Amino acid sequence: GSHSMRYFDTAMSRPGRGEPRFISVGYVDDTQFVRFDSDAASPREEPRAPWIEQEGPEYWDRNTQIFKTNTQTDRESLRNLRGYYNQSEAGSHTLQSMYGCDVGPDGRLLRGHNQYAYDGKDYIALNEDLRSWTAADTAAQITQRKWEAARVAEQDRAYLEGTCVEWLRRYLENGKDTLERADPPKTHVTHHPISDHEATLRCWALGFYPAEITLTWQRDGEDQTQDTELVETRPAGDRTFQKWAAVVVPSGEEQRYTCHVQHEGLPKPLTLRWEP
């Protein structure tokens, strides 16, 4: 019943190949709903959810102009960070950020986020108080100084407590048929002999949304964390996700093993066994 909105921004310099690419992707939970890309050949293409298209040209024009401003700001920020780290003009560098809000079932703010990474390392983040910063190093301390001087946290707080929460509500209402629907996993257990004395049991979860899921193997009711191979949850391409967990078991001992599945779309948690 809880939900999040998050934008994932990436600015990446490419010396000799133009100005840095900037892309901003917006998500409600695990659903991408907008994408803005500085390299877009036609803004008429920058994909958006059907429930965003219904917002009309005013929404799109406003957001396009914010994106253009953000492109400039993060391009100049890349330039400044290159200086703070005494880096040459020759290499490519990456500035990432994530920002947005988490709300509960009642649509009330649980917490806000606004953080950044440079070349894959945490750089600066707005604290949970939405008033103060945590800077990772002496470079980020300069950004902190500039942002404190310009009262940026106050603007970020206003967005996170106001705009973000208000629009997440609007989006959840307009997109309810998908955004507020949890699709349970379809599950099964497969069995693959490895040798005459061992076999793999693989517990499958397919077709679920959102991506959050718990998939565990037990032996005689004891968690098999160390002995379980657990692949990363992966997108199917139709909004849903997939995952599997596998354990290697001695031949004939299969019935000592149970797969346990928890997911928001399930009426109740599943317990599965290999069914020869």
């Binding site: 942002w147 967005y159 973000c164």
Partner: peptide
């Protein structure tokens, strides 16, 4: 809805 980034880092 996008958040405005106005102040250079």
């Amino acid at each position: 809805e996008l958040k405005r980034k106005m102040i250079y880092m």
